């Protein structure tokens, strides 16, 4: 009766706005008194590095979050996030979980430690936005970014240095001078929380064309909910879900033609198939890890070599 | 219940059970006593030719259906169902509608003979499956076939003989060659309904790249709900189109790949552009015929246009 929850996102203020707000306010309109959710941004609560234990623990009913982020202690969490080049597109994502084994996978490895995966979502591609122009790879050699960790482990072989900040203290890094740019998102996202104001250039090569994050909730309050509540809860996520499908997919092309605050620039194709080919090296070398790592990689393995074999609109020629 | 809704949807009952029978019975386990929908599939309270009036005038609560099929008394019934090559990727359609403007002239035009437009969504594209093979143009002529108002007659110019039948009728009605095909679905829905079973290519060049569908409601019935089933019922509908975003996008690509009731035929490029340029004739026909049919088709071009301009992944040069 009239439970009260808290959640907190990865999301700063200004992005959480456009990725998690309005479902949460869809949700706490339709239950009214049975249940309400409090949203909390980025870092409000706890810090990131306490985000997941938080949760664990039951300080924090609920987390809109990547797997990587917040390094929580599982077999999956180096694929939440960016996964080097894992999917091309943004529906890759609910496809990999609903129909080729992921929902099942994640919920087992959260339950071993306490928690509910309620569903994963797709957000943005991962591109470089940065003061100075990315034209070759060597250009991305010294440069300090806001990034994820895997991702960010995987571009430290290019000499990027990965950092990580709090979201709410990147935008003046930027504006000066900590970072020489963000390796975070996709071009709706800068222009959106106003990175865009303090970065000059856009490179269009990605090195995702998916971020990976999920909604989770603390087992045990997961399994006090009424049935009525948890499938409001389950289908307002999915509505957040699909939400962020079309804003994405209209704000990156919307914004790449008519937005005037990000120059673009590109790598050659044949000189980025470099860093593609390193990915696959990064892969194998997860999959050594462990049993678990190894059979998730195979299914993106499988998966991208399905879509070069079904042909347009998923690959073209 | 306290409030009652029949809903009647263009799908036929195996096609039902998957784009619009799970969301119906959410809403039904979330709404409870307070309100239920039932759910009623291809002309069963009423003949397609008499859906939409039936909900006018109040006989029918809801319908879940295309423009086009129901011949609803607008501007805009040209553009639902299939408009030829209108869009190569099933997010445009929610992208279209709401950061577009789709949206607001559907609102207007449906709300001007008694309506509420609830929510446009993509369903799947559109491609030939037939007795024969096709691979060239030439192959076209003459085939009589199951599609849509508007796609059949563009389709009429390459000799195609648009046949309309019942939905529960087609698949008899391709066993005795009543029809030699259809052109009214992707492959996915082709597995799932049987039509593969009595039908043995499919041919891999599309007409379009995503039915457009919606829910509709009697308006009288719509101002009659309170405000938090109303926003249930819209929450419903968008995990509605969600499910259909990711069922097709990976029903496309795994059935052509691994399925083996049909065998995949193409049309070499340099023929089907014949095709893609008709189009554009037809767009500039339809948009001769009234001014709100002119403002879409612009806004198609437009929208077009600017995927060109945007690049990978909306277009591939
Ligand atoms: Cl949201
Ligand atoms: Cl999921
Ligand atoms: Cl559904
Ligand atoms: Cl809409």
Same mark, same amino acid.
């Given at each position: ?31 009214? $008194? ?19 234990? /938080? ?11 990547? $797997?990587?982020?917040?390094?929580? +202690? ?5 694929? %939440?996030?960016?996964? +080097? ?8 994502? +609910?496809?990999?979980? #609903? ?11 959260? /339950? ?28 991305? &050699? ?37 970072? $020489? ?12 929380? %106003?990175?865009? #104001? ?6 269009? #090569? ?45 704000? &990156? ?14 790598? +050659? ?18 999959? /050594? ?14 998966? #991208? ?13």
């Amino acid at each position: 009766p009239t439970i009260k929850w808290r959640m907190q996102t990865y999301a700063g203020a200004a992005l959480a706005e456009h990725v998690a707000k309005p479902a949460i306010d869809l949700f706490n309109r339709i239950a009214g $008194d049975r249940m309400q959710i409090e949203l909390y941004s980025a870092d409000q609560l706890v810090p990131t590095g306490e985000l997941f234990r /938080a949760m664990q623990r039951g300080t924090i009913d609920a987390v809109q979050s990547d $797997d990587d982020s917040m390094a929580s +202690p599982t077999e999956v969490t180096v694929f %939440g996030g960016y996964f +080097p080049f894992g999917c091309r597109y943004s529906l890759d994502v +609910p496809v990999l979980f #609903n129909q080729y084994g992921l929902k099942e996978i994640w919920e087992e490895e959260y /339950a071993k430690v306490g928690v509910k995966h309620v569903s994963a979502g797709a957000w943005d591609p991962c591109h470089f936005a940065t003061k100075e122009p990315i034209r070759s790879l060597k250009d991305l &050699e010294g440069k300090r970014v806001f990034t994820f960790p895997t991702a960010g482990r995987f571009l430290s072989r290019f000499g990027v240095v990965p950092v990580t900040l709090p979201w709410e203290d990147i935008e003046v890094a930027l504006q000066t001078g900590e970072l $020489d740019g963000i390796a975070w998102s996709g071009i709706t996202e800068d222009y959106t929380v %106003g990175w865009a #104001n303090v970065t000059n250039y856009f490179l269009t #090569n990605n090195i995702s064309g998916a971020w990976i994050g999920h909604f989770f909730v603390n087992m045990e309050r997961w399994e006090e909910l009424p049935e009525d509540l948890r499938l409001l809860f389950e289908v307002c996520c999915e509505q957040s879900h699909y939400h962020r499908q079309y804003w994405y997919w209209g704000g &990156e092309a919307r914004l790449r033609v008519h937005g005037d605050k990000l120059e673009l620039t590109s790598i +050659p194709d044949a000189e980025w198939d470099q860093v593609e080919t390193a990915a696959q090296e990064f892969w194998d070398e997860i999959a /050594a890890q462990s049993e678990t790592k190894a059979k998730v990689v195979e299914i993106f393995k499988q998966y #991208n070599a399905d879509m070069r074999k079904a042909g347009r609109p998923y690959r073209y020629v």
